[PDB]
Protein backbone atom coordinates (compact mmCIF):
# COMPACT_ATOMS: atom_id res chain seq x y z
CA UNK A 1 0.00 0.00 0.00
CA UNK A 2 1.62 3.19 -1.34
CA UNK A 3 0.31 6.77 -1.05
CA UNK A 4 1.47 7.48 -4.63
CA UNK A 5 -0.42 4.53 -6.15
CA UNK A 6 -3.41 5.10 -3.83
CA UNK A 7 -3.91 8.64 -5.19
CA UNK A 8 -2.82 7.98 -8.81
CA UNK A 9 -6.41 8.23 -10.22
CA UNK A 10 -6.86 11.67 -8.57
CA UNK A 11 -3.43 13.22 -7.69
CA UNK A 12 -0.63 12.31 -10.18
CA UNK A 13 2.40 13.84 -8.40
CA UNK A 14 1.74 12.32 -4.93
CA UNK A 15 4.78 11.37 -2.76
CA UNK A 16 5.76 7.71 -2.34
CA UNK A 17 4.98 6.41 1.18
CA UNK A 18 4.36 2.93 2.49
CA UNK A 19 1.03 2.94 4.37
CA UNK A 20 -0.16 0.53 7.08
CA UNK A 21 -3.85 1.14 7.88
CA UNK A 22 -6.42 3.75 6.90
CA UNK A 23 -8.30 5.44 9.75
CA UNK A 24 -10.58 8.45 10.36
CA UNK A 25 -9.89 8.30 14.11
CA UNK A 26 -6.79 10.26 15.23
CA UNK A 27 -6.85 8.42 18.60
CA UNK A 28 -6.08 5.02 17.00
CA UNK A 29 -3.85 6.50 14.27
CA UNK A 30 -0.46 4.79 14.75
CA UNK A 31 2.98 4.95 13.08
CA UNK A 32 2.84 4.31 9.32
CA UNK A 33 -0.96 4.85 9.06
CA UNK A 34 -2.90 6.97 6.59
CA UNK A 35 -4.99 9.35 8.66
CA UNK A 36 -8.06 10.69 6.84
CA UNK A 37 -9.35 14.02 8.17
CA UNK A 38 -13.03 14.56 7.30
CA UNK A 39 -15.71 17.16 8.12
CA UNK A 40 -19.11 16.00 9.40
CA UNK A 41 -21.83 16.95 11.90
CA UNK A 42 -19.96 19.12 14.49
CA UNK A 43 -16.70 17.16 14.02
CA UNK A 44 -13.77 18.44 11.91
CA UNK A 45 -10.95 15.87 11.65
CA UNK A 46 -8.42 18.47 10.40
CA UNK A 47 -8.29 19.70 14.01
CA UNK A 48 -6.38 16.50 14.89
CA UNK A 49 -3.76 16.76 12.08
CA UNK A 50 -0.93 17.78 14.52
CA UNK A 51 -1.81 14.92 16.96
CA UNK A 52 -1.82 12.38 14.10
CA UNK A 53 1.51 13.78 12.85
CA UNK A 54 2.90 13.64 16.41
CA UNK A 55 1.80 9.96 16.59
CA UNK A 56 3.88 9.24 13.46
CA UNK A 57 1.27 8.72 10.73
CA UNK A 58 2.91 8.16 7.32
CA UNK A 59 0.47 10.52 5.54
CA UNK A 60 -2.82 12.45 5.74
CA UNK A 61 -5.72 13.04 3.36
CA UNK A 62 -7.89 16.00 4.36
CA UNK A 63 -11.06 17.86 3.33
CA UNK A 64 -9.94 20.69 1.03
CA UNK A 65 -12.98 22.89 1.90
CA UNK A 66 -11.83 26.42 2.93
CA UNK A 67 -8.20 25.43 3.64
CA UNK A 68 -6.93 24.29 0.21
CA UNK A 69 -7.57 23.46 -3.46
CA UNK A 70 -8.42 19.96 -4.75
CA UNK A 71 -5.27 17.85 -5.21
CA UNK A 72 -3.15 20.32 -3.22
CA UNK A 73 -0.08 18.53 -1.85
CA UNK A 74 1.30 20.09 1.35
CA UNK A 75 4.04 18.93 3.72
CA UNK A 76 3.93 19.34 7.52
CA UNK A 77 6.81 18.07 9.70
CA UNK A 78 7.94 15.90 6.74
CA UNK A 79 4.52 14.18 6.48
CA UNK A 80 2.47 14.64 3.25
CA UNK A 81 -0.93 16.31 3.72
CA UNK A 82 -2.97 15.94 0.52
CA UNK A 83 -6.23 17.91 0.31
CA UNK A 84 -9.27 16.63 -1.62
CA UNK A 85 -12.59 18.39 -2.23
CA UNK A 86 -15.82 16.54 -1.31
CA UNK A 87 -13.79 13.96 0.65
CA UNK A 88 -16.92 12.40 2.24
CA UNK A 89 -18.19 11.62 -1.28
CA UNK A 90 -14.84 10.06 -2.29
CA UNK A 91 -14.01 8.15 0.89
CA UNK A 92 -15.59 4.88 -0.35
CA UNK A 93 -13.53 5.04 -3.58
CA UNK A 94 -10.37 5.99 -1.67
CA UNK A 95 -10.83 3.07 0.77
CA UNK A 96 -11.85 0.68 -2.04
CA UNK A 97 -8.54 1.34 -3.79
CA UNK A 98 -6.59 1.12 -0.50
CA UNK A 99 -8.13 -2.31 0.28
CA UNK A 100 -7.61 -3.70 -3.26
CA UNK A 101 -11.22 -3.34 -4.48
CA UNK A 102 -12.81 -6.19 -2.45
CA UNK A 103 -16.22 -5.76 -4.18
CA UNK A 104 -14.44 -6.64 -7.49
CA UNK A 105 -13.11 -9.84 -5.85
CA UNK A 106 -16.41 -11.37 -4.75
CA UNK A 107 -20.09 -11.24 -5.80
CA UNK A 108 -21.63 -8.48 -3.67
CA UNK A 109 -25.41 -8.30 -3.37
CA UNK A 110 -26.93 -5.27 -1.66
CA UNK A 111 -30.34 -5.43 0.02
CA UNK A 112 -32.28 -2.28 0.90
CA UNK A 113 -35.76 -1.58 2.32
CA UNK A 114 -37.57 -1.33 5.65
CA UNK A 115 -38.73 -4.94 6.09
CA UNK A 116 -37.17 -8.29 5.21
CA UNK A 117 -33.63 -6.91 4.73
CA UNK A 118 -32.06 -9.21 7.31
CA UNK A 119 -33.92 -12.32 6.18
CA UNK A 120 -33.41 -11.72 2.44
CA UNK A 121 -29.69 -11.07 3.13
CA UNK A 122 -29.41 -14.37 5.05
CA UNK A 123 -31.32 -16.33 2.40
CA UNK A 124 -29.00 -14.94 -0.33
CA UNK A 125 -25.92 -15.94 1.69
CA UNK A 126 -27.35 -19.41 2.57
CA UNK A 127 -28.60 -20.25 -0.91
CA UNK A 128 -25.41 -19.13 -2.68
CA UNK A 129 -23.36 -21.22 -0.20
CA UNK A 130 -25.54 -24.30 -0.87
CA UNK A 131 -24.65 -23.76 -4.54
CA UNK A 132 -20.93 -23.81 -3.66
CA UNK A 133 -19.93 -20.24 -2.75
CA UNK A 134 -18.18 -19.33 0.48
CA UNK A 135 -20.77 -16.79 1.57
CA UNK A 136 -20.70 -13.92 4.05
CA UNK A 137 -23.10 -11.34 5.43
CA UNK A 138 -22.71 -7.70 6.38
CA UNK A 139 -25.46 -5.85 8.23
CA UNK A 140 -27.18 -5.23 11.56
CA UNK A 141 -26.92 -8.80 12.93
CA UNK A 142 -23.18 -8.35 12.19
CA UNK A 143 -20.39 -9.03 9.67
CA UNK A 144 -18.70 -12.36 8.95
CA UNK A 145 -18.63 -15.62 7.01
CA UNK A 146 -21.87 -17.58 7.23
CA UNK A 147 -22.19 -19.08 10.74
CA UNK A 148 -19.33 -16.91 12.08
CA UNK A 149 -20.98 -13.48 12.21
CA UNK A 150 -19.29 -11.04 14.64
CA UNK A 151 -21.94 -8.67 16.14
CA UNK A 152 -21.93 -4.95 15.18
CA UNK A 153 -23.07 -4.20 18.77
CA UNK A 154 -22.38 -0.43 19.09
CA UNK A 155 -20.23 0.42 16.06
CA UNK A 156 -21.37 2.73 13.24
CA UNK A 157 -19.51 1.74 10.07
CA UNK A 158 -18.02 4.50 7.90
CA UNK A 159 -17.20 4.19 4.18
CA UNK A 160 -13.68 3.09 5.23
CA UNK A 161 -14.95 0.41 7.67
CA UNK A 162 -17.29 -0.99 5.00
CA UNK A 163 -14.40 -1.46 2.55
CA UNK A 164 -12.07 -2.71 5.32
CA UNK A 165 -14.56 -5.33 6.54
CA UNK A 166 -15.33 -6.45 2.97
CA UNK A 167 -11.57 -6.87 2.37
CA UNK A 168 -11.45 -8.87 5.63
CA UNK A 169 -14.07 -11.25 4.24
CA UNK A 170 -12.19 -11.47 0.93
CA UNK A 171 -9.04 -12.44 2.90
CA UNK A 172 -11.02 -15.17 4.71
CA UNK A 173 -11.97 -16.74 1.32
CA UNK A 174 -15.47 -15.29 0.82
CA UNK A 175 -16.70 -15.45 -2.80
CA UNK A 176 -20.19 -14.05 -2.06
CA UNK A 177 -21.43 -11.36 0.31
CA UNK A 178 -25.02 -10.34 1.01
CA UNK A 179 -24.97 -6.82 2.48
CA UNK A 180 -27.75 -4.89 4.20
CA UNK A 181 -27.65 -1.27 3.00
CA UNK A 182 -29.36 1.20 5.35
CA UNK A 183 -31.15 4.28 4.00
CA UNK A 184 -28.74 6.36 6.11
CA UNK A 185 -25.68 4.49 4.79
CA UNK A 186 -26.62 5.19 1.17
CA UNK A 187 -27.24 8.91 1.77
CA UNK A 188 -23.91 9.27 3.63
CA UNK A 189 -22.03 7.70 0.67
CA UNK A 190 -20.93 4.71 2.75
CA UNK A 191 -21.33 2.28 -0.17
CA UNK A 192 -20.66 4.82 -2.93
CA UNK A 193 -17.79 2.93 -4.68
CA UNK A 194 -18.97 -0.65 -4.11
CA UNK A 195 -19.52 -2.76 -7.22
CA UNK A 196 -22.85 -4.40 -6.45
CA UNK A 197 -23.53 -7.43 -8.66
CA UNK A 198 -27.16 -6.97 -7.69
CA UNK A 199 -29.33 -4.58 -5.67
CA UNK A 200 -32.49 -5.98 -4.04
CA UNK A 201 -35.36 -3.72 -2.99
CA UNK A 202 -37.68 -5.46 -0.49
CA UNK A 203 -39.64 -2.21 -0.55
CA UNK A 204 -39.16 1.45 -1.63
CA UNK A 205 -42.23 2.96 0.15
CA UNK A 206 -41.83 4.95 3.39
CA UNK A 207 -44.10 6.62 5.95
CA UNK A 208 -44.58 10.42 6.07
CA UNK A 209 -44.71 10.77 2.24
CA UNK A 210 -48.44 11.60 1.78
CA UNK A 211 -47.85 14.98 0.10
CA UNK A 212 -47.10 14.63 -3.65
CA UNK A 213 -44.10 16.98 -3.31
CA UNK A 214 -42.60 14.94 -0.44
CA UNK A 215 -43.04 11.62 -2.30
CA UNK A 216 -41.60 13.36 -5.40
CA UNK A 217 -38.54 14.64 -3.52
CA UNK A 218 -37.96 11.30 -1.75
CA UNK A 219 -38.04 9.38 -5.06
CA UNK A 220 -35.80 12.01 -6.74
CA UNK A 221 -33.31 11.94 -3.88
CA UNK A 222 -33.07 8.12 -4.10
CA UNK A 223 -33.09 7.88 -7.91
CA UNK A 224 -30.25 10.43 -8.04
CA UNK A 225 -28.19 8.38 -5.55
CA UNK A 226 -28.76 5.12 -7.46
CA UNK A 227 -27.71 6.83 -10.72
CA UNK A 228 -24.31 7.49 -9.05
CA UNK A 229 -23.86 3.91 -7.71
CA UNK A 230 -22.91 0.66 -9.43
CA UNK A 231 -26.15 -1.18 -8.58
CA UNK A 232 -25.74 -4.08 -11.02
CA UNK A 233 -28.95 -6.04 -11.55
CA UNK A 234 -31.97 -4.47 -9.84
CA UNK A 235 -34.38 -6.90 -8.20
CA UNK A 236 -37.51 -5.11 -7.07
CA UNK A 237 -40.52 -6.16 -5.00
CA UNK A 238 -43.52 -5.29 -7.20
CA UNK A 239 -45.97 -5.70 -4.27
CA UNK A 240 -44.64 -2.31 -3.10
CA UNK A 241 -46.34 0.77 -4.63
CA UNK A 242 -43.08 2.67 -5.25
CA UNK A 243 -41.47 -0.57 -6.45
CA UNK A 244 -44.06 -0.90 -9.26
CA UNK A 245 -43.58 2.71 -10.42
CA UNK A 246 -39.81 2.24 -10.52
CA UNK A 247 -40.15 -1.11 -12.35
CA UNK A 248 -42.13 0.72 -15.10
CA UNK A 249 -39.02 2.90 -15.67
CA UNK A 250 -36.40 0.11 -15.37
CA UNK A 251 -36.83 -2.38 -18.27
CA UNK A 252 -33.74 -4.41 -17.15
CA UNK A 253 -34.94 -4.73 -13.51
CA UNK A 254 -36.51 -8.01 -12.32
CA UNK A 255 -40.10 -7.73 -11.02
CA UNK A 256 -41.00 -10.03 -8.11
CA UNK A 257 -44.58 -10.53 -6.82
CA UNK A 258 -46.72 -12.88 -4.76
CA UNK A 259 -49.84 -10.66 -5.13
CA UNK A 260 -50.32 -10.65 -8.93
CA UNK A 261 -48.45 -7.36 -9.67
CA UNK A 262 -46.34 -8.69 -12.58
CA UNK A 263 -47.38 -7.01 -15.84
CA UNK A 264 -46.60 -9.55 -18.64
CA UNK A 265 -46.92 -6.87 -21.39
CA UNK A 266 -43.51 -5.29 -20.62
CA UNK A 267 -41.64 -8.54 -21.54
CA UNK A 268 -39.10 -7.87 -18.76
CA UNK A 269 -37.71 -10.45 -16.38
CA UNK A 270 -40.13 -11.51 -13.66
CA UNK A 271 -40.89 -14.08 -10.96
CA UNK A 272 -44.25 -14.55 -9.23
CA UNK A 273 -45.86 -16.92 -6.77
CA UNK A 274 -48.93 -18.34 -8.52
CA UNK A 275 -50.07 -20.22 -5.39
CA UNK A 276 -48.86 -20.82 -1.84
CA UNK A 277 -50.00 -23.57 0.50
CA UNK A 278 -49.16 -22.53 4.07
CA UNK A 279 -48.93 -25.86 5.94
CA UNK A 280 -47.77 -27.03 9.38
CA UNK A 281 -44.01 -27.13 8.59
CA UNK A 282 -43.65 -24.27 6.09
CA UNK A 283 -44.94 -23.21 2.68
CA UNK A 284 -45.27 -24.91 -0.68
CA UNK A 285 -44.65 -22.12 -3.20
CA UNK A 286 -45.66 -22.61 -6.83
CA UNK A 287 -44.08 -19.99 -9.04
CA UNK A 288 -43.62 -18.95 -12.65
CA UNK A 289 -40.67 -16.92 -14.00
CA UNK A 290 -38.93 -15.82 -17.18
CA UNK A 291 -36.34 -18.50 -16.23
CA UNK A 292 -38.92 -21.31 -15.96
CA UNK A 293 -41.53 -22.54 -13.48
CA UNK A 294 -41.26 -24.66 -10.37
CA UNK A 295 -42.33 -25.62 -6.88
CA UNK A 296 -40.33 -24.84 -3.72
CA UNK A 297 -40.79 -26.37 -0.26
CA UNK A 298 -39.82 -23.56 2.11
CA UNK A 299 -39.34 -24.26 5.82
CA UNK A 300 -39.92 -20.55 6.59
CA UNK A 301 -43.24 -19.27 7.98
CA UNK A 302 -45.63 -16.52 6.86
CA UNK A 303 -46.32 -14.49 3.72
CA UNK A 304 -43.45 -12.04 4.29
CA UNK A 305 -40.94 -14.93 4.18
CA UNK A 306 -42.44 -16.12 0.89
CA UNK A 307 -41.69 -12.63 -0.49
CA UNK A 308 -38.16 -12.63 0.98
CA UNK A 309 -37.47 -16.10 -0.45
CA UNK A 310 -38.80 -15.09 -3.91
CA UNK A 311 -36.58 -11.99 -3.88
CA UNK A 312 -33.50 -14.12 -3.11
CA UNK A 313 -34.53 -16.63 -5.81
CA UNK A 314 -35.05 -13.88 -8.43
CA UNK A 315 -31.69 -12.31 -7.52
CA UNK A 316 -29.72 -15.58 -7.83
CA UNK A 317 -31.48 -16.43 -11.09
CA UNK A 318 -30.63 -12.94 -12.44
CA UNK A 319 -26.98 -13.58 -11.50
CA UNK A 320 -27.05 -16.81 -13.54
CA UNK A 321 -27.35 -19.54 -10.90
CA UNK A 322 -29.29 -22.39 -12.64
CA UNK A 323 -32.96 -22.79 -11.67
CA UNK A 324 -32.57 -26.57 -11.29
CA UNK A 325 -29.75 -26.19 -8.73
CA UNK A 326 -31.67 -23.50 -6.83
CA UNK A 327 -34.79 -25.75 -6.68
CA UNK A 328 -32.66 -28.71 -5.46
CA UNK A 329 -31.24 -26.67 -2.53
CA UNK A 330 -34.33 -24.63 -1.50
CA UNK A 331 -35.46 -27.14 1.20
CA UNK A 332 -32.14 -26.60 3.03
CA UNK A 333 -32.81 -22.86 3.51
CA UNK A 334 -33.41 -22.24 7.24
CA UNK A 335 -35.04 -19.36 9.19
CA UNK A 336 -32.95 -16.73 10.93
CA UNK A 337 -32.57 -18.24 14.42
CA UNK A 338 -35.62 -17.42 16.59
CA UNK A 339 -37.34 -15.55 13.73
CA UNK A 340 -40.56 -17.47 13.04
CA UNK A 341 -38.55 -20.65 13.62
CA UNK A 342 -40.79 -23.70 13.21
CA UNK A 343 -40.46 -26.89 15.25
CA UNK A 344 -42.49 -29.89 14.13
CA UNK A 345 -42.65 -33.50 15.20
CA UNK A 346 -44.90 -36.41 14.08
CA UNK A 347 -48.43 -36.03 15.45
CA UNK A 348 -47.54 -33.04 17.63
CA UNK A 349 -48.76 -29.41 17.44
CA UNK A 350 -46.56 -27.15 15.33
CA UNK A 351 -44.55 -24.80 17.56
CA UNK A 352 -43.05 -21.51 16.35
CA UNK A 353 -40.38 -19.64 18.34
CA UNK A 354 -40.18 -15.93 17.53
CA UNK A 355 -38.36 -12.99 19.16
CA UNK A 356 -41.46 -10.73 18.90
CA UNK A 357 -41.50 -8.56 22.05
CA UNK A 358 -43.46 -5.48 20.88
CA UNK A 359 -47.19 -5.14 19.95
CA UNK A 360 -46.53 -4.78 16.20
CA UNK A 361 -44.06 -7.71 16.03
CA UNK A 362 -46.42 -9.91 18.06
CA UNK A 363 -49.36 -9.07 15.79
CA UNK A 364 -47.24 -9.80 12.67
CA UNK A 365 -45.97 -13.09 14.14
CA UNK A 366 -49.51 -14.28 15.04
CA UNK A 367 -50.87 -13.26 11.60
CA UNK A 368 -48.02 -15.22 9.98
CA UNK A 369 -48.60 -18.26 12.26
CA UNK A 370 -52.36 -18.16 11.57
CA UNK A 371 -51.72 -18.93 7.86
CA UNK A 372 -50.16 -22.30 8.83
CA UNK A 373 -52.81 -23.10 11.48
CA UNK A 374 -55.72 -25.39 10.60
CA UNK A 375 -56.80 -25.71 14.26
CA UNK A 376 -56.35 -23.25 17.13
CA UNK A 377 -53.56 -20.66 17.42
CA UNK A 378 -51.94 -20.52 20.90
CA UNK A 379 -49.79 -17.56 22.02
CA UNK A 380 -47.32 -18.00 24.92
CA UNK A 381 -45.66 -14.75 25.97
CA UNK A 382 -44.81 -12.26 28.69
CA UNK A 383 -43.13 -8.86 28.99
CA UNK A 384 -39.79 -7.79 30.43
CA UNK A 385 -39.70 -6.37 33.94
CA UNK A 386 -38.14 -3.01 34.91
CA UNK A 387 -38.76 -1.69 31.36
CA UNK A 388 -41.44 0.53 29.76
CA UNK A 389 -44.83 -0.80 30.87
CA UNK A 390 -46.94 0.79 28.12
CA UNK A 391 -46.59 -2.13 25.67
CA UNK A 392 -48.00 -4.63 28.21
CA UNK A 393 -51.79 -4.04 27.79
CA UNK A 394 -51.26 -3.56 24.02
CA UNK A 395 -49.57 -6.98 23.76
CA UNK A 396 -52.41 -8.45 25.85
CA UNK A 397 -55.06 -7.07 23.47
CA UNK A 398 -53.11 -8.35 20.43
CA UNK A 399 -52.71 -11.86 21.91
CA UNK A 400 -56.45 -11.91 22.71
CA UNK A 401 -57.51 -10.79 19.22
CA UNK A 402 -55.05 -12.59 16.92
CA UNK A 403 -54.75 -15.84 18.91
CA UNK A 404 -57.41 -18.32 20.04
CA UNK A 405 -55.65 -19.11 23.34
CA UNK A 406 -53.46 -16.57 25.14
CA UNK A 407 -51.06 -18.10 27.66
CA UNK A 408 -49.55 -15.25 29.70
CA UNK A 409 -46.33 -16.10 31.51
CA UNK A 410 -42.97 -14.61 32.60
CA UNK A 411 -40.27 -13.14 30.31
CA UNK A 412 -37.20 -11.71 32.09
CA UNK A 413 -39.14 -10.25 35.08
CA UNK A 414 -35.79 -9.00 36.53
CA UNK A 415 -36.47 -7.34 39.94
CA UNK A 416 -40.14 -6.55 39.25
CA UNK A 417 -42.90 -8.65 40.83
CA UNK A 418 -43.58 -11.26 38.08
CA UNK A 419 -47.38 -11.31 38.66
CA UNK A 420 -47.55 -7.48 38.56
CA UNK A 421 -46.25 -7.61 34.96
CA UNK A 422 -48.86 -10.26 34.07
CA UNK A 423 -51.64 -8.11 35.60
CA UNK A 424 -50.56 -5.19 33.34
CA UNK A 425 -50.80 -7.52 30.33
CA UNK A 426 -54.24 -8.83 31.36
CA UNK A 427 -55.51 -5.25 31.93
CA UNK A 428 -55.40 -4.72 28.16
CA UNK A 429 -57.77 -7.62 27.45
CA UNK A 430 -61.54 -7.47 26.93
CA UNK A 431 -61.90 -10.90 28.58
CA UNK A 432 -58.86 -11.57 30.80
CA UNK A 433 -60.72 -14.55 32.29
CA UNK A 434 -60.38 -16.32 28.92
CA UNK A 435 -56.56 -16.11 29.07
CA UNK A 436 -54.47 -18.77 30.77
CA UNK A 437 -51.90 -17.54 33.24
CA UNK A 438 -49.03 -19.81 34.19
CA UNK A 439 -45.88 -18.69 35.92
CA UNK A 440 -42.73 -20.54 35.26
CA UNK A 441 -42.19 -19.86 31.56
CA UNK A 442 -41.09 -23.45 30.93
CA UNK A 443 -44.31 -24.66 32.60
CA UNK A 444 -46.44 -22.26 30.51
CA UNK A 445 -44.76 -23.38 27.27
CA UNK A 446 -45.29 -27.01 28.37
CA UNK A 447 -48.96 -26.31 29.14
CA UNK A 448 -49.64 -24.98 25.64
CA UNK A 449 -47.62 -27.66 23.84
CA UNK A 450 -48.99 -30.63 25.81
CA UNK A 451 -52.62 -29.41 25.55
CA UNK A 452 -52.61 -28.17 21.94
CA UNK A 453 -54.07 -30.50 19.29
CA UNK A 454 -52.12 -32.01 16.38
CA UNK A 455 -53.49 -29.38 13.95
CA UNK A 456 -52.88 -26.45 16.35
CA UNK A 457 -49.98 -24.00 16.23
CA UNK A 458 -48.26 -22.61 19.35
CA UNK A 459 -46.36 -19.34 19.02
CA UNK A 460 -43.76 -18.93 21.80
CA UNK A 461 -42.94 -15.21 21.59
CA UNK A 462 -40.47 -12.82 23.21
CA UNK A 463 -37.04 -14.44 23.26
CA UNK A 464 -36.26 -16.03 19.90
CA UNK A 465 -32.58 -17.00 20.23
CA UNK A 466 -32.03 -15.25 23.62
CA UNK A 467 -31.04 -18.25 25.78
CA UNK A 468 -31.63 -16.83 29.30
CA UNK A 469 -34.38 -15.91 31.78
CA UNK A 470 -33.45 -12.85 33.88
CA UNK A 471 -35.09 -13.39 37.31
CA UNK A 472 -33.95 -11.09 40.10
CA UNK A 473 -30.26 -10.48 39.35
CA UNK A 474 -29.70 -14.00 37.93
CA UNK A 475 -29.29 -14.71 34.21
CA UNK A 476 -30.63 -18.27 34.58
CA UNK A 477 -29.92 -20.73 31.75
CA UNK A 478 -33.17 -21.21 29.81
CA UNK A 479 -34.07 -21.52 26.14
CA UNK A 480 -37.50 -21.49 24.47
CA UNK A 481 -35.97 -23.45 21.57
CA UNK A 482 -34.50 -26.15 23.82
CA UNK A 483 -37.69 -26.37 25.93
CA UNK A 484 -39.80 -26.74 22.77
CA UNK A 485 -37.45 -29.29 21.18
CA UNK A 486 -37.56 -31.51 24.29
CA UNK A 487 -41.37 -31.28 24.48
CA UNK A 488 -41.66 -32.32 20.82
CA UNK A 489 -38.96 -35.02 21.06
CA UNK A 490 -36.74 -33.23 18.52
CA UNK A 491 -33.35 -31.43 18.67
CA UNK A 492 -33.12 -27.62 18.75
Ligand SMILES: Cc1ccc(CN2CCS(=O)(=O)CC2)cc1
Nearest residue numbers: 157161162165180181182185190
Ligand atom coordinates in the same frame (compact mmCIF):
# COMPACT_ATOMS: atom_id res chain seq x y z
C1 LIG B 1 -17.79 -1.54 11.55
C2 LIG B 1 -18.83 -1.86 10.53
C3 LIG B 1 -20.19 -1.89 10.90
C4 LIG B 1 -21.17 -2.17 9.94
C5 LIG B 1 -20.80 -2.43 8.61
C6 LIG B 1 -21.86 -2.77 7.59
N1 LIG B 1 -22.23 -1.58 6.73
C7 LIG B 1 -22.90 -0.48 7.53
C8 LIG B 1 -23.18 0.74 6.64
S1 LIG B 1 -24.19 0.42 5.30
O1 LIG B 1 -25.49 0.07 5.75
O2 LIG B 1 -24.08 1.51 4.39
C9 LIG B 1 -23.39 -0.91 4.61
C10 LIG B 1 -23.11 -2.06 5.60
C11 LIG B 1 -19.45 -2.39 8.24
C12 LIG B 1 -18.47 -2.10 9.20
Ligand SMILES: Cc1ccc(CN2CCS(=O)(=O)CC2)cc1
Nearest residue numbers: 199223226227228231234246250
Ligand atom coordinates in the same frame (compact mmCIF):
# COMPACT_ATOMS: atom_id res chain seq x y z
C1 LIG C 1 -32.37 0.53 -8.82
C2 LIG C 1 -31.95 1.71 -9.63
C3 LIG C 1 -30.73 1.69 -10.33
C4 LIG C 1 -30.36 2.79 -11.09
C5 LIG C 1 -31.21 3.91 -11.16
C6 LIG C 1 -30.85 5.09 -12.01
N1 LIG C 1 -30.53 4.65 -13.40
C7 LIG C 1 -30.12 5.82 -14.23
C8 LIG C 1 -29.56 5.30 -15.58
S1 LIG C 1 -30.70 4.43 -16.50
O1 LIG C 1 -31.83 5.21 -16.77
O2 LIG C 1 -30.00 3.79 -17.57
C9 LIG C 1 -31.20 3.27 -15.37
C10 LIG C 1 -31.69 3.92 -14.04
C11 LIG C 1 -32.41 3.92 -10.47
C12 LIG C 1 -32.78 2.83 -9.70
